[PDB]
Design a protein around this ligand. Structure first.
Ligand code: MG
Ligand code: MG
Ligand code: ZN
Ligand code: ZN
Ligand code: ZN
Ligand code: ZN
Lengths: 274, 278, 278, 274
C-alpha cells in the first residue's frame, strides 16, 4: 500500500544499438523515451549520456542538453545523473557534472570486479565525491553492490561525510562480480540495511535475468524498483524489449494487480527527500 | 529460472468458516462448487482444495455429501485435481476428519501439528497425525502436508525418518497468516522454504496466505519455484476493502501475473507429475 | 559488543518430566531445590525457573508446596530471582496452572501458545492465555513469555496491541528443541531474534535449548546479546552420552565460556533491572 | 561433533612489532610460534613472510626458509602460504611462490576497498593464479570477502578454471570495505555457499572485534576457524595477546567445553582434500 517509485535507467554506458535497436542515444531520443516512461509510471530517470556515435560521454554540455530536453517534455520527472559512467573513466570526469546542480545523482559506494574489468571507487575518491554532493546541494542515490558497502556507507555517515538523512540506497544486483539478485540476497540486503542505517530507504536494480525476481520481492517489501536498458534489454528470455517504457509499464501493471499505488511526483520527491 | 518452472494454482473455494454474509459469492452446494471449479480451471487452477457444506452453509464431514461434491466437480471438469480437506471445521472429531480418505481421492490434506487458530485451537494430536498418515497408505492417497509453523517441518521430517510418511517427493503446503500461526511476511516465507530445503531436501511446496498475506506470499512464490493457493477459504478480498467477485477472479489475477513474468502454468498432466499423483 | 552486555543465566533445575532414574542428581524436594539454587547462584545463575514436585517425584501445583519451595530457596539465596512456572506438567488444568500467581512471585512464565509436545499436546487456549495475562496485572507479577514457534511472537504482539499485555520491556524466552516445536539450530535462533526485533522492538530475550540444542543455542546467544537458560528440565546431559553432575555444573560451563570471551555476568541488581523486576 | 580445524595466521603483512611485541617476523620466530600453536590445537599455519626489518616479503628464498623452519619443528602441520601479500604488491610477485609447491595456498576471489586502499585482484589475474595452482598441484584456500565473490568462484568452477572439489572457502569478515563478521552475515554466507557450491567446506576469519562472534558461530555450525595476529592482536578488548598460541588455546578450550573434537593432522588433510 506504500507508494512505489519506478526508475527508468534508459541508456547506460555499455548497451549497443546493434543489440537493442530502441536504445536512446541522443538527448532528443532520451526525452522521447522519458515521456513514454513517465506516462507508463516512472518518476525518476537514471541518466547516462552518449555522443552521437554511441560512445559514452562525460561532457558537461552534453549532460546539459539531455537534462534540458527531458525537463522540457516532463517537467515533473526527477532527473538523476550518473557519476558511475563507463567502467575505466577518470574519476575527475565522473565527478564534474555535479556542477550542473542536478536534483539527484548517483554515488557509488565501493570497488568491485565488474565483468572482465574492475569498477574502481577508491576510498579517497568516494570521500571527495561525497563532499562535492554537499557543496552542490545534490541529493545522493548511493549505489551498493555488496554487503560491505552498506557498512562502508555507515562509517561515512558516522564521520559526518555523508549527512543526507533519510539516505536513499540503490541495491544493484546481478553484476558479474557483485551480489546476485536472488530473493535470499535482496531479503538479506534490506534487513542488513535496516540494521546498519535504520532510516534509509531503498530501491533495487536487477541486472539481466534478475530483473523479475528483484522486482517482485521489492513490490511486497516496500522497496522501490529500477528497470531499463542499462540493466536489461529483454522483455522476456530471448525477446528484445520494444522500449524502456514497455519495461516500466509491466511493473505498473503488476503494481495495479496487487493494489500498490504508484508514487506521484510529489510523493516521490517527499520520499527521496528532494 | 521461473520461465522453466510450471506453476500449480490451487483454489480453496469454500472452507469451513467463510460465510455467505461476508462473501455473497461463496459456493456452498455441490452444484455451486462444480460451477466454480470449472471457472477456476479455465482461469488456470489445477487443484481444488475441497471442504463441503450442507445446503444451509454448515460445515459437513459426511461421506455421502463428499461423494456428491466430488462427483459434481468431476463431471464438469474431470481434469482438475480434487484434494479433500481432512482439517474440516472448528472442533470436529478426528474420526470424522479421517473417514473421507476411504473415498480414495487423488490427494488429501495431512495437518502436521496443533496450533491456536483464532479464538479456538486446531487440534492434531500426535497419535492422530500418525493414524491419519497410516490411513493415507491404507487407501493409497497422496498427502498434501499442511504446515503452519517451523516446528511442523521438523515433526514431518521425524515421521519420514520413522517410515510413517514414505511419500517421496512429499508436497508441503505452507499456510501462513492464521492468527496463532506463522505470518506470511516475506522473511517468513523465505525462511520456511529454506528450512524445508534443509530438513526435507526433495520436498516440493505451495503457499497459502490468509487475508492480507495473499499478495506477499504469492509474489515471493512466483519467483522462488513455489506453487500458490488462493480462494475464499483463505481470503475473500480482491483488494483491501474490496470483496472478490469469485474464486476464479483470484485465480485469474495469479495467471495474469505469471503471464507478465513469463512463468508457465502447469498443465493437468504436469500438476499430476509434480505432485506424484500418477 | 558482548564485553558490555551483561549475561543473565537461568537454571531450570527440576521441571515436570525429568526423572530421578535418568538423572540421579535431580533435585525434587524444597530442601534439595534450595541447595541446588545456592550452588547455581554461586556458579553464575541469577534466575531459578521453578517447578515443584511431591516428595515421591510427582509434579505438583499446590500453593502450600510452592510456598515451601520459594521460602526454602529465599532463605539460603535471597539474591536469586525465583520465576514460577505456570506451564506445569502434561495435562494439568489451567486453573491449577494460574493459581500460584496469587503467591506474588517476582516473575512467572506466560506460555504464548499451544503446541504438540512429544507424544501429547501442551494446551494454552487463547481465552486462557488472556485470563493468565490479566492475572499478571491483578497480582503485579512480571511475565516471562515462553515462545516455541514464530507465530507465538505475532500472537504476543497482538496482545500488546490490544493492551492485554502492557509489560514493557517484555522478556521473551525462546524454548527451542521440543519435539513439536521449533528446533534450536542456529538458523532458527537467528531468525527468531530478528523476527522478535521486527515485531516487538523493545523486547529482551533468552533461549532454552532442549537436549542437543543446548550448546548451539547458548553459543549463538553469547554473541548476540541474548540471555541463556540451562538445567535438568531442558537437558540432563553435560555432553552427548555423559550425564551432568548437577545443574550448577551446567551453569558453570556457561560462566566459563562467558569469561573466555569477556562477556560479564549480570549481578542480581542488573538482572532485576534488565528484566524490569524493581 | 564434527572435527574442528584451527588455522593460525601468525604474521600477516601489516601488523607491527611496536603494536604487538610478540609478532613473529623471522623464520625462526615463526617456527617457534608454529610449534606452540600446533600444541595448542592448530593444524594449519597461514603464512606471510617478512624481512628482518619487518617489511613484507615476497622473496622465494625467504618463503623457503620459513617453510623449512616450520616443517622441521612440526612436520605434521599444514603450511598454507599467502598469495595475497601486502596490499599494493605486484601480482607477479604474489603468484611466484606457488613454484615452491606448498601443500596449500590462498587464492583471493575478488577486488575490494581495503581500509584506505584497494586490494586488487583483476579478473584476468584470478584466472592466471587459478591456472598456476593446477600447474603446481597446490590445493587452494579461496578467500571470500563478500557475497558476490562466491558467485564469481562458482562461475570459475562451471568454466573448469577451478576444478578442486571439495573446494575450501575462507570467509574473511571484518575488513573495512568488506562484509562484517556479525552473526547474521556468517549465517548468510554459509547458507549462500551451500546453495552455490554445495560440496564446499568453509572456515572463517574474523578481523579485530569480529574474532569472537565468528568463532562461536563457526563452532556450532560445522565451520572451521582462523585466528592470529594477522587478523587480531588483542586477547580481550584493550588487552594485547601474549602469542598466537594464546588465541588458539582459547578456541581449543571452548571446543573442549562444548565437546567438539579438534581435527588430527590426518583428519585436517582428509577434510581439506590434501
Ligand atoms: Mg520507440
Ligand atoms: Mg613468546
Ligand atoms: Zn548507471
Ligand atoms: Zn482447508
Ligand atoms: Zn518450565
Ligand atoms: Zn593473509
Amino acid at each position: 500500500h506504500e507508494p512505489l517509485i519506478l526508475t527508468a535507467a534508459i541508456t547506460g554506458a555499455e548497451t549497443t544499438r546493434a543489440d537493442q535497436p530502441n536504445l536512446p542515444i541522443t538527448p532528443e531520443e532520451q526525452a522521447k523515451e522519458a515521456k513514454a516512461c513517465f506516462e507508463a509510471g516512472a518518476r525518476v530517470i537514471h541518466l547516462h549520456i552518449r555522443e552521437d556515435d554511441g560512445r559514452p560521454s562525460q561532457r558537461l554540455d552534453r549532460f546539459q542538453e539531455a537534462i534540458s530536453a527531458i525537463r522540457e517534455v516532463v517537467p515533473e520527472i526527477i532527473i538523476q545523473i550518473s557519476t558511475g559512467g563507463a567502467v575505466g573513466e577518470s574519476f575527475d570526469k565522473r565527478l564534474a557534472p555535479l556542477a550542473l546542480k542536478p536534483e539527484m545523482a548517483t554515488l557509488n559506494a565501493g570497488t568491485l570486479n565488474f565483468g572482465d574489468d574492475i569498477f574502481i571507487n577508491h576510498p579517497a575518491d568516494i570521500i571527495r565525491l561525497a563532499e562535492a554532493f554537499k557543496q552542490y546541494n545534490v541529493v545522493p542515490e548511493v549505489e551498493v553492490y555488496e554487503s560491505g558497502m552498506v557498512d562502508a556507507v555507515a562509517r561515512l555517515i558516522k564521520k559526518g561525510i555523508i549527512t543526507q538523512n533519510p539516505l536513499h540506497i540503490q541495491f544493484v544486483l546481478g553484476v558479474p562480480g557483485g551480489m546476485s539478485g536472488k530473493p535470499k540476497n535482496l531479503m538479506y540486503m534490506m534487513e542488513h540495511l535496516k540494521e546498519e542505517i535504520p532510516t534509509a530507504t531503498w530501491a533495487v536494480a536487477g541486472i539481466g535475468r534478475w530483473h523479475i525476481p528483484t522486482s517482485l520481492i521489492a513490490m511486497v517489501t516496500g522497496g522501490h524498483i529500477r528497470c531499463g536498458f542499462e540493466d536489461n534489454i529483454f522483455y522476456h528470455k530471448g525477446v528484445i524489449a520494444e522500449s524502456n517504457a514497455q519495461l516500466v509499464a509491466r511493473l505498473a501493471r503488476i503494481a495495479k494487480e496487487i493494489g500498490r499505488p504508484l508514487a506521484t511526483p510529489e510523493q516521490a520527491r517527499e520520499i527521496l527527500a528532494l
